[PDB]
Design a protein around this ligand. Structure first.
Ligand SMILES: [Ca+2]
Ligand SMILES: [Ca+2]
Ligand SMILES: [Ca+2]
Ligand SMILES: [Ca+2]
Ligand SMILES: [Zn+2]
Length: 316
């Protein structure tokens, strides 16, 4: 829409009050003209037709419970855009300021959120397993990171390349959660998963086995469900990323942590310069070792810690 840029105020899914960038033209719309070609948030109105209607509001105040998921989808797409721009010098997901579009209230009782290839889509959850999925900044950033991956490495969504694809989304989803300093941790989806159970989450990067996912290449899933285990086998890479950052001893192998910031620079470089659509875990290790080498030198501690971490999860 063409109109005047302004700032509105609302409440997110968790009840927190935040300011959001809107556009005025008769109604106030969830259209943020301050980032790239814009961030646009739509109402799918409980249907599956996309994208739905661009979200329009009469008074620029979004405190209705139906507004909540839109406020957070809009606001956390802005935080993720800022992360990639400020930290990685990337402008939007295609690197040339593509517009970011999201639809909320997709379908009814839908327990998922996803990047479909062109935009973000968020379910409201059924109220028991999940609450509206855009209230989780690591979910929003996880999904937005699939759009980055699609434009750069292009990892196909199955077997080991799909598991890398998923791990890369968990890593960056987690780094964005630390960047916003929103009660950060290494778990995924804990703010929106099971409102009735405290302390759990969908997955854990620091201990994937807590929820049954593999934390070592010898325990990988080899069947056909889940497109060959893309959400299960990502545990092996997630555990490696956690060790590179935080350090620890895993199956007797000790890793000195080098921190989150270098973790993000190594993996972003590996993703945008060395990974290809069919990369497997072994070529992820080579890509991360080569990235760390480019950035810090072949005799750095950073290179040593990348090697130890993949050795600890059994990836040669
Ligand atoms: Ca209103
Ligand atoms: Ca958290
Ligand atoms: Ca988290
Ligand atoms: Ca819970
Ligand atoms: Zn994913």
């Amino acid at each position: 829409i063409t109109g005047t840029s302004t700032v509105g105020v609302g409440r997110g899914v968790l009840g927190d009050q935040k300011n959001i960038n809107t556009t005025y033209s008769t109604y106030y719309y969830l259209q943020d003209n301050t980032r790239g070609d814009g961030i646009f948030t739509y109402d799918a109105k409980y249907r599956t037709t996309l994208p739905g209607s661009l979200w329009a509001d009469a008074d620029n105040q979004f405190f209705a419970s139906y507004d909540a998921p839109a406020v957070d989808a809009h606001y956390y797409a802005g935080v993720t855009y800022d992360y990639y721009k400020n930290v990685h010098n990337r402008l939007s997901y295609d690197g040339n300021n593509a517009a970011i579009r999201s639809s909320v209230h997709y379908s009814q009782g839908y327990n998922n959120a996803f990047w479909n290839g062109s935009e973000m889509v968020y379910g409201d959850g059924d109220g028991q397993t999940f609450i509206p999925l855009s209230g989780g900044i690591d979910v929003v950033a996880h999904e937005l990171t699939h759009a980055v991956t699609d434009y750069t490495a292009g990892l196909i969504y199955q077997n080991e390349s799909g598991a890398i694809n998923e791990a890369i989304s968990d890593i960056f989803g987690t780094l964005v959660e630390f960047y916003a300093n929103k009660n950060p941790d290494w778990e995924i989806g804990e703010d929106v998963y099971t409102p009735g159970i405290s302390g759990d989450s969908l997955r854990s990067m620091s201990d994937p086995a807590k929820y049954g996912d593999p934390d070592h290449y010898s325990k990988r899933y080899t069947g056909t469900q889940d497109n060959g285990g893309v959400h299960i086998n990502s545990g092996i890479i997630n555990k490696a990323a956690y060790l590179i950052s935080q350090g620890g001893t895993h199956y007797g192998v000790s890793v000195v942590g080098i921190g989150r910031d270098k973790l993000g620079k190594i993996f972003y470089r590996a993703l945008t310069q060395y990974l290809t659509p069919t990369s497997n875990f072994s070529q992820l290790r080579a890509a991360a070792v080569q990235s760390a080498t480019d950035l810090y030198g072949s005799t750095s501690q950073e290179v040593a810690s990348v090697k130890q971490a993949f050795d600890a999860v059994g990836v040669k």
